[PDB]
């Protein structure tokens, strides 16, 4: 089976040139097209027949296919270009074949998160579970650490988190962490806190609330 | 013209 | 304008059957080969099947050959994908796409919105929606205990988009999903502006609106 090779990730400074590569043995002898897929969105054709731009695609996008590699270059990379890029061609062994995709990350200045804590709602508490949520908003880079403390006791095994993909306007990330407790355990303690460590913070930031205040 | 071939 | 609107999707048990359809407009449907492409959660694009303009020839990836059937109705401008003997490996977002072929050059110039097909023996469950409430303030909704994915979340029926972050769902220890959607607003707008999250869980036909307000 014929295979197309793409690096899974590529990082580019804002306003700089991204060169997304797609390699294959007979690549220069085949016609390659490119798709841009933003997170949770439908793929969009951005380049076809190696070098042709569909109408509406910015001139900053350029294609080439020479030798063993097809390349999609993007000049003056913008936050709006953050996406996964897939190359695609045809071969007798597989019919339509796609590369594995390359996630384009835009490098920007460090931005500290804005931290918010949310108590569980009374509607949820009645059902026997408490979800406590910590939001880390609009930070950069992606690496961040969230620690939950209940009456100053570090928690483990009862939290899950997820992170958005890079923002299409400011290139930051956001993170939501949920601490799950039984209503009985929630009612046994007073101080609920989430402690955040990030490069943009000179010291960890703690946001907290007292149950019943 | 419509063929996939 | 070219339009491709997909129907079908959701939960199906292993060994089960599900039919997707794709309604087309804004072009001479019979002049184009059409295709199905899929993407497993967090994975890459994979071509599934194609059908020539006339419907005379059909093609399938090795992974689905013998289990799927692609067909089209050129009078009604509809493409169909009948999927049988479904496996957990078929769980994916499926897209229908218009293909331009010159066999050397094959590409997809227009794509439908995707539909998520989840192959699982677990029960469908609708979500409960809980408010998230406490310069800048954050508010939100916690969309909890639903299955399968996905849910769609909007704020104020789509009128509020700036500063919104709808997170990827997490799969909980219960085997149910939970997701949060937040928005940052001026703290002083909390007394006079209404902030409502609109949640749609199409697999269970459940729609929920929830006001996010301080206690």
- Three-class HEC string of B1-5: CCCCC
The verdict on a CB contact (< 8 Å) between B5 and C103 is yes
Angle, vertex CA A92, rays to CA A88 and CA A97, nearest 5 = 20
**A100 and A124 share one domain:** no
Give the CB-side neighbour count of residue A179, counting CA atoms within 13 A.
24
The verdict on a CB contact (< 8 Å) between B2 and C59 is no
The verdict on a CB contact (< 8 Å) between A33 and C107 is yes
Return the residue matching tokens 């007394």: C191
What CATH number is associated with residue A87? 2.60.40.10
Torsion of CA A173, C158, C208, A168, to 10 degrees: -10
Query: C120: burial class by Cβ within 10 Å (0-12, 13-18, 19+)?
Result: middle
Query: Is the CB of residue A101 less than 8 Å from the CB of residue A85?
Result: yes
Strands (DSSP E) along chain C, which ranges?
A: 3-7, 10-12, 18-25, 33-39, 45-51, 58-60, 68-73, 78-83, 92-101, 106-111, 115-119, 128-132, 136-146, 152-155, 164-166, 170-171, 177-186, 196-201, 206-211
Q: What is the DSSP string of chain A?
A: ----B--SEEEEETTS-EEEEEE-TTGGGS--EEEEE-TTS--EEEEBTTTBPPTTS-TTEEEEEETTEEEEEESS--GGG-EEEEEEEEETTTEEEE---EEEEEE---BPPEEEEEPPPHHHHTTTEEEEEEEEEEEBSS--EEEEEETTEEP-SSEEEEEPPPPTTT--EEEEEEEEEEHHHHHT--EEEEEEE-TT-SS-EEEEEETT-
Give me the resolution in angstroms, 1 decimal. Answer: 1.6
**A119 and A208 share one domain:** yes
**A45 and A125 share one domain:** no
Q: Which one of A67, A88, A108 terminates a domain?
A: A108
**A101 and A71 share one domain:** yes
Residue C167 distance to chain A (closest CA, Å):
6
Q: Which CATH architecture has domain C1-121?
A: Sandwich (2.60)
Chain B residue whose CA is closest to C29: B2
Chain C residues in contact with B2 by the CB 8 A cut-off are 30-33, 52-54
Residue B2 distance to chain C (closest CA, Å):
4
**A56 and A84 share one domain:** yes
Residue B3 distance to chain C (closest CA, Å):
5
How many Å apart are CA C34 and CA C96, to the nearest integer?
7
| C-contacting residues in A 173-212 (Cβ below 8 Å) | 174, 176, 178, 180
Query: Is the CB of residue C23 less than 8 Å from the CB of residue C12?
Result: no
A109 and chain C in contact, CB less than 8 A: no
Tokens at A181, concatenated: 């407790």
Residue C68, beta-bridge partner list: C83
Report the domain count for chain A.
Answer: 2
Q: How far is CA A150 from CA A22, A159, C16, C96, C179, in A?
A: 50, 12, 46, 49, 23
**A148 and A115 share one domain:** yes
Return the residue matching tokens 């997820």: A162
**A39 and A129 share one domain:** no
Is the bond leading into A141 cis (omega within 30 degrees of zero)? yes
**A159 and A125 share one domain:** yes
Chain C residues in contact with A30 by the CB 8 A cut-off are 104
How many Å apart are CA C9 and CA C18, to the nearest integer?
7
CATH H superfamily, domain C122-214? Immunoglobulins (2.60.40.10)
Backbone Cα Rg of chain B: 4
Interface test with C, best of A38, A176, A177, A207 (most C CBs within 10 A): A176
**A208 and A121 share one domain:** yes
Two domains, one topology: C1-121 and C122-214: yes
Q: Which one of A59, A76, A108 terminates a domain?
A: A108
Tokens at A78, concatenated: 């913008």
Chain A residue whose CA is closest to C47: A96
**A93 and A114 share one domain:** no
Residue A139 distance to chain C (closest CA, Å):
13
Q: Which one of A108, A123, A156 terminates a domain?
A: A108
Q: How far is CA A74 from CA A58, A59, A78, A103, C45, in A?
A: 9, 9, 9, 13, 21
Q: Which domain holds residue A194?
A: 109-213
Q: How far is CA A104 from CA A20, A35, A142, C28, C58, in A?
A: 9, 13, 14, 36, 35
Q: Greatest CA separation found in chain B?
A: 11
Subunit partners of chain A (3 or more CB pairs within 8 A): C
**A73 and A114 share one domain:** no
The residues, ordered by sequence, that sit 6+ positions from A203 with a Cβ below 8 Å of its Cβ are none
- Give residue limits of the domains in chain C: 1-121, 122-214
């Amino acid at each position: 089976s014929y295979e197309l090779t793409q690096l899974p990730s590529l990082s580019v400074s804002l306003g700089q040139t991204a060169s997304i590569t797609c390699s294959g043995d007979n690549l220069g002898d085949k016609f390659v097209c490119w798709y841009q897929q933003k997170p949770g969105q439908t793929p969009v054709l951005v380049m076809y027949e190696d070098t042709k731009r569909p109408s509406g695609i910015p001139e900053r996008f350029a294609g080439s296919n020479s030798g063993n590699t097809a390349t999609l270059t993007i000049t003056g990379t913008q936050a709006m270009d953050e996406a996964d890029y897939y190359c695609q061609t045809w071969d007798s062994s597989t019919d339509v074949v796609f590369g594995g995709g390359t996630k384009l990350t835009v490098l920007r200045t460090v931005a500290a998160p804005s931290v918010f804590i949310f108590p569980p709602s009374d509607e949820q508490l009645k059902s026997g579970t408490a979800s406590v949520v910590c939001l880390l908003n609009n930070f950069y880079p992606r690496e961040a650490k969230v620690q939950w403390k209940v009456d100053n006791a570090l928690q483990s095994g009862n939290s899950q988190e997820s992170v958005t993909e890079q923002d299409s306007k400011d290139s930051t990330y956001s993170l939501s962490s949920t601490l799950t407790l039984s209503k009985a355990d929630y009612e046994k303690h007073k101080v609920y806190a989430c402690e955040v460590t990030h490069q943009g913070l000179s010291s960890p930031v703690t946001k907290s609330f007292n149950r019943g205040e | 013209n419509g063929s996939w071939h | 304008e070219v339009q491709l609107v997909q129907s079908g999707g959701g939960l199906v048990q292993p060994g089960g059957s599900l039919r997707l359809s794709c309604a087309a407009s804004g072009f001479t449907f019979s002049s184009y080969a059409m295709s199905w492409v899929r993407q497993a959660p967090g994975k890459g694009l994979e071509w599934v099947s194609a059908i020539s303009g006339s419907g005379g020839s059909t093609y399938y990836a090795d992974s689905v050959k013998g289990r799927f059937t692609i067909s089209r109705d050129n009078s009604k401008n509809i493409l169909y994908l009948q999927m049988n003997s479904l496996k957990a490996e078929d769980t994916a977002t499926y897209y229908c796409a218009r293909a331009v072929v010159f066999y050397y050059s094959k590409y997809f110039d227009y794509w439908s919105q995707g539909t998520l097909v989840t192959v699982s023996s677990a029960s469908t469950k609708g979500p409960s929606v809980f408010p998230l409430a406490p310069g800048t303030a954050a508010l939100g909704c916690l969309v909890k205990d639903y299955f399968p994915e996905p849910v769609t979340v909007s704020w104020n029926s789509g009128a509020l988009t700036s500063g919104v972050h709808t997170f990827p769902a997490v799969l909980q220890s219960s085997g149910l999903y939970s997701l949060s959607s937040v928005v940052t607003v001026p703290s002083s707008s909390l007394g006079t502006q209404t902030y409502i999250c609109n949640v749609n869980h199409k697999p269970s036909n459940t729609k929920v609106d929830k006001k996010a307000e301080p206690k």
